[PDB]
Design a protein around this motif. Structure first.
Motif, mmCIF file in Angstrom:
data_model
loop_
_atom_site.group_PDB
_atom_site.id
_atom_site.type_symbol
_atom_site.label_atom_id
_atom_site.label_comp_id
_atom_site.label_asym_id
_atom_site.label_seq_id
_atom_site.Cartn_x
_atom_site.Cartn_y
_atom_site.Cartn_z
ATOM 1 N N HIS C 102 0.832 -1.191 0.000
ATOM 2 C CA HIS C 102 0.000 0.000 0.000
ATOM 3 C C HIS C 102 0.866 1.241 0.000
ATOM 4 O O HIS C 102 1.555 1.513 0.974
ATOM 5 C CB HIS C 102 -0.912 0.015 1.215
ATOM 6 C CG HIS C 102 -1.822 1.197 1.264
ATOM 7 N ND1 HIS C 102 -2.453 1.601 2.419
ATOM 8 C CD2 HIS C 102 -2.217 2.056 0.299
ATOM 9 C CE1 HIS C 102 -3.195 2.662 2.165
ATOM 10 N NE2 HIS C 102 -3.068 2.961 0.884
ATOM 11 N N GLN C 104 0.980 5.455 -0.649
ATOM 12 C CA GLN C 104 0.233 6.691 -0.781
ATOM 13 C C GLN C 104 1.179 7.829 -1.107
ATOM 14 O O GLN C 104 1.951 8.243 -0.252
ATOM 15 C CB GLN C 104 -0.506 6.994 0.513
ATOM 16 C CG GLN C 104 -1.551 5.972 0.879
ATOM 17 C CD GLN C 104 -2.148 6.235 2.238
ATOM 18 O OE1 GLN C 104 -1.518 6.854 3.092
ATOM 19 N NE2 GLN C 104 -3.369 5.767 2.449
ATOM 20 N N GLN C 106 2.472 11.319 -1.310
ATOM 21 C CA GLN C 106 2.185 12.618 -0.719
ATOM 22 C C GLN C 106 2.807 13.695 -1.580
ATOM 23 O O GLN C 106 3.917 13.534 -2.077
ATOM 24 C CB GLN C 106 2.721 12.698 0.712
ATOM 25 C CG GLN C 106 2.042 11.787 1.735
ATOM 26 C CD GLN C 106 2.657 11.850 3.123
ATOM 27 O OE1 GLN C 106 3.829 12.185 3.283
ATOM 28 N NE2 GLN C 106 1.871 11.499 4.131
ATOM 29 N N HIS C 143 -1.472 2.770 -12.112
ATOM 30 C CA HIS C 143 -0.885 4.069 -11.826
ATOM 31 C C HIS C 143 -1.911 5.050 -11.324
ATOM 32 O O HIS C 143 -3.099 4.747 -11.253
ATOM 33 C CB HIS C 143 -0.257 4.658 -13.079
ATOM 34 C CG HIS C 143 -1.264 5.086 -14.097
ATOM 35 N ND1 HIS C 143 -1.951 6.275 -14.008
ATOM 36 C CD2 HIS C 143 -1.725 4.471 -15.210
ATOM 37 C CE1 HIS C 143 -2.780 6.382 -15.030
ATOM 38 N NE2 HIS C 143 -2.661 5.300 -15.775
ATOM 39 N N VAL C 144 -1.442 6.245 -10.997
ATOM 40 C CA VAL C 144 -2.332 7.366 -10.783
ATOM 41 C C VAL C 144 -1.670 8.649 -11.258
ATOM 42 O O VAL C 144 -0.513 8.915 -10.950
ATOM 43 C CB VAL C 144 -2.755 7.457 -9.319
ATOM 44 C CG1 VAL C 144 -1.545 7.614 -8.424
ATOM 45 C CG2 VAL C 144 -3.731 8.601 -9.127
ATOM 46 N N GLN C 153 -3.262 14.102 -2.434
ATOM 47 C CA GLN C 153 -2.723 12.772 -2.203
ATOM 48 C C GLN C 153 -3.142 11.811 -3.302
ATOM 49 O O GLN C 153 -4.212 11.951 -3.882
ATOM 50 C CB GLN C 153 -3.192 12.254 -0.850
ATOM 51 C CG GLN C 153 -2.613 10.923 -0.432
ATOM 52 C CD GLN C 153 -3.062 10.521 0.956
ATOM 53 O OE1 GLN C 153 -3.745 11.281 1.641
ATOM 54 N NE2 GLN C 153 -2.683 9.322 1.379
ATOM 55 N N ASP C 155 -3.652 7.759 -3.854
ATOM 56 C CA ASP C 155 -3.719 6.482 -3.161
ATOM 57 C C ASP C 155 -3.769 5.335 -4.153
ATOM 58 O O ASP C 155 -4.737 5.201 -4.899
ATOM 59 C CB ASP C 155 -4.948 6.435 -2.254
ATOM 60 C CG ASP C 155 -4.856 7.405 -1.091
ATOM 61 O OD1 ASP C 155 -3.737 7.868 -0.788
ATOM 62 O OD2 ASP C 155 -5.906 7.713 -0.486
ATOM 63 N N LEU C 156 -2.737 4.501 -4.166
ATOM 64 C CA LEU C 156 -2.749 3.343 -5.043
ATOM 65 C C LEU C 156 -2.403 2.065 -4.292
ATOM 66 O O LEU C 156 -1.464 2.027 -3.505
ATOM 67 C CB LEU C 156 -1.806 3.566 -6.230
ATOM 68 C CG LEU C 156 -0.306 3.812 -6.075
ATOM 69 C CD1 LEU C 156 0.442 2.518 -5.940
ATOM 70 C CD2 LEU C 156 0.220 4.592 -7.263
ATOM 71 N N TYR C 157 -3.196 1.028 -4.529
ATOM 72 C CA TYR C 157 -3.009 -0.266 -3.890
ATOM 73 C C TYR C 157 -2.395 -1.246 -4.870
ATOM 74 O O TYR C 157 -2.896 -1.410 -5.975
ATOM 75 C CB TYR C 157 -4.338 -0.809 -3.383
ATOM 76 C CG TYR C 157 -4.957 0.015 -2.288
ATOM 77 C CD1 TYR C 157 -4.629 -0.208 -0.962
ATOM 78 C CD2 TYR C 157 -5.869 1.009 -2.577
ATOM 79 C CE1 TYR C 157 -5.188 0.537 0.043
ATOM 80 C CE2 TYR C 157 -6.435 1.760 -1.579
ATOM 81 C CZ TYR C 157 -6.089 1.521 -0.270
ATOM 82 O OH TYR C 157 -6.651 2.271 0.734
ATOM 83 N N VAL D 15 -5.471 12.902 5.314
ATOM 84 C CA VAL D 15 -5.207 13.540 4.034
ATOM 85 C C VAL D 15 -6.371 14.424 3.638
ATOM 86 O O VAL D 15 -7.526 14.082 3.876
ATOM 87 C CB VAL D 15 -4.932 12.492 2.943
ATOM 88 C CG1 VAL D 15 -4.741 13.155 1.600
ATOM 89 C CG2 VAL D 15 -3.716 11.675 3.291
ATOM 90 N N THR D 22 -6.320 3.216 -6.898
ATOM 91 C CA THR D 22 -6.305 2.374 -8.086
ATOM 92 C C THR D 22 -5.799 0.973 -7.782
ATOM 93 O O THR D 22 -5.052 0.764 -6.834
ATOM 94 C CB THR D 22 -5.423 2.964 -9.191
ATOM 95 O OG1 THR D 22 -4.081 3.081 -8.712
ATOM 96 C CG2 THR D 22 -5.933 4.328 -9.611
#
Lengths: 48, 212, 222, 222, 48
Positions: C102, C104, C106, C143-144, C153, C155-157, D15, D22
């Motif tokens: 996980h 994130q 920033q 991706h993001v 922020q 957030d990608l899992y 946040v 994603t």
């Protein structure tokens, strides 16, 4: 050719003192919903 | 609590075992192997079929012998049990009985038919029975071609022993061939594969022979 | 005076001629303490390595063009490069990792700046070669995108994705997140030029296997 | 574009201006691997520090009289004096211990020797002074006698007993097991003189609390 | 001592032309939900 796309100014960019002078933009071609492809064929290109 | 475990009865399960009492050797097969607090014994089949099963493993054939034949004279060719291949996995057992496939592969520059015949008894049955091989189960093989013909088990010894080289009862057979059609340089290659083998009794794992 | 066996986790003990155990008078073996001298939940200790940690910050300025690399993180070796990190001490024993990830990203941009960084994920066997990939296509990856304006922020899992079933801890095997410049930033004057980027990571679905001596490496899959 | 909070174990993340997360196409986040490439149970890693370990062996000879001390173990500092021990890496973070104790005294005597060692347990605040105690009375303690003949192993379970609610890891606070000579051994000739004694320990009801910097000590109860 | 609290930079303050250069911050200790106090005792201090 698949045809031109033209990008022109309706209203010039209005920049502030705290704001950038000019912005950088990007075009992306996403393929559609229904788009089929047909009749596979070799090409002369390498690695693709 | 969670971590610890205790005896005193089940110390058999935690791996303490007296080798002096083995029961039957096959009784050890039933024995549950020891396990600590964390181990997960689970049988995971990655393939549907099992390569370990006797039936499957000897399905894959193996190559014994290569010779060119330029002469119409009957060729004596003797088949030993496999060495130096996956067939050597069969070296654990003495007594063996089952029918076996023979894949012969004919190569002829000049067009030639070649014949195949098999005899469990050797050249000598006490008389010379090799006079003509036509009557003993001959199966004719076309030129530049190959066939899968399998030999049934005919033997005066109900159980062949793998180890011994003694021509009488030890080998898994003796193979006869002759070319026809006035040719030379007819070259063959012959493959032996078992079918539904029955292996009886084990032996210890054999030594690799450097000195032969 | 019989056979007594004892097994905990990996270790086990097979004793002969045992003696019945002893305990102090009126023992109470209940673990938890009531009343509590600590407000924390007792499952803290094993859970602790899952704690989210600062990871490999980087500095993205004007000068850097497109396709340039802001910062780099080697995923699996990232959570315990040093002794300081929470997951280090317990990863210094077990040699394999099934863990999921996980992360994130920033970022903070002073309002009035415009540009984008892209947070991608490249597995190891992919990472072996950058030279093969067209840049315009990196969005195929999980991706993001991150806009300068109006994104605090990202957030990608990332689920576990790798060739071999289990991956070696001390190595790079999971590949890693690489953050690229999608477009240059545009700064009006006066403003701070450098826009600081900190990849604030985490870990989930913790797993470890295959014990080894504390400092020594061991091969498994190769 | 709203407020998103994230909390894992101790750490937490608040946040603003968040972006929806994603994940790769058709993700499967199930932790365990079926089929299994490892026979072990996935609860191994957190359980691992509970593993039983060799502790402080000692050598008990003829010459030593009664009331003499064969070997000494400082209980709580015993399970991780070095980096080699399994419970070390995870005890190098958390500063407090509620843990209970399991210690199994291993001994081997060649048949035909006679004598006894006593395995006792002395808590810290008791251990401060040996000089006060009559020797003949040590059997008041939680303990187990060990006969030379016909005793392979001595199993004693020690619940947590200490003044303060929680005890400091890096210190001696739990006190420790001390093994004393109850009577001299008697050796016929020829025999090996030295009878080796190994205290083979363990740990149960694992607990840790109160995070600290990895190498630094911290006061709590005093 | 009740222990350190450390405050460090993940990302430096980004200031604009219309925006201040540096900001002033304040820490406050609010006592918890469950916090008891015990066994009243005098001290040497005056007016408190």
């Amino acid at each position: 050719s698949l045809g031109h796309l033209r990008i022109d100014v309706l209203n010039r960019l209005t920049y502030n003192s705290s704001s950038p002078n000019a912005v950088n933009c990007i075009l992306q071609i996403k393929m559609g919903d229904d788009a089929m492809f047909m009749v596979p064929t070799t090409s002369n290109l390498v690695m693709q | 609590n969670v971590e610890a475990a205790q005896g005193e009865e089940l110390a058999t399960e935690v791996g303490l075992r007296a080798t002096e009492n083995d029961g039957s050797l096959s009784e050890q097969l039933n024995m549950s192997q020891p396990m600590f607090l964390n181990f997960k014994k689970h049988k995971v089949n990655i393939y549907a079929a099992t390569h370990t099963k006797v039936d499957h493993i000897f399905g894959r054939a193996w190559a014994v012998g290569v010779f060119n034949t330029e002469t119409a004279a009957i060729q004596k060719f003797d088949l030993h049990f496999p060495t130096s291949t996956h067939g050597a996995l069969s070296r654990f057992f003495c007594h063996w009985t089952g029918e076996l496939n023979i894949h012969i592969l004919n190569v002829s520059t000049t067009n030639a038919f070649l014949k195949v015949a098999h005899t469990w008894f050797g050249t000598d049955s006490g008389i010379a029975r090799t006079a003509t091989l036509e009557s003993n189960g001959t199966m004719i093989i076309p030129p530049n071609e190959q066939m899968t013909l399998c030999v049934p088990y005919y033997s005066e010894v109900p159980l062949r022993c793998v180890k011994g080289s003694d021509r009488n009862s030890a080998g898994l057979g003796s193979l006869f061939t002759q070319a026809v059609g006035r040719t030379i340089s007819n070259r063959v290659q012959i493959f032996v594969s078992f079918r539904c083998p029955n292996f009886f009794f084990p032996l210890p794992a054999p030594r690799e022979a450097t000195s032969a | 005076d019989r056979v007594a066996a004892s097994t905990t986790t990996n270790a086990g003990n097979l004793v002969q001629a045992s003696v019945a155990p002893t305990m102090p008078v009126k023992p109470d073996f209940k673990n938890t303490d009531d009343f509590l001298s600590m407000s924390y939940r007792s499952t803290t200790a094993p859970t602790n390595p899952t704690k989210m940690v600062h990871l490999a910050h980087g500095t993205w300025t004007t000068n850097q063009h497109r396709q340039a690399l802001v910062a780099s993180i080697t995923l699996l070796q990232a959570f315990w490069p040093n002794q300081d990190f929470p997951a280090w001490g317990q990863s210094r024993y077990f040699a394999a990792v099934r863990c999921g990830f996980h992360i994130q990203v920033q970022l903070n941009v002073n309002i009035g700046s415009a540009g984008c960084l892209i947070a991608a994920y490249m597995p190891k066997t992919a990472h072996d070669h950058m030279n093969t990939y067209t840049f315009g296509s990196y969005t195929n990856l999980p991706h993001v995108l991150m806009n300068a304006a109006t994104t605090s922020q990202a957030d990608l899992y990332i689920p576990y994705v790798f060739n071999h079933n289990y991956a070696r801890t001390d190595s790079d095997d999971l590949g890693g997140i690489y953050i690229w410049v999608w477009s240059a930033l545009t700064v009006p004057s006066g403003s701070p030029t450098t826009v600081d980027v900190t990849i604030f990571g985490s870990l989930l679905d913790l797993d470890f296997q295959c014990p080894r001596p504390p400092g020594a490496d061991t091969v498994i899959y190769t």
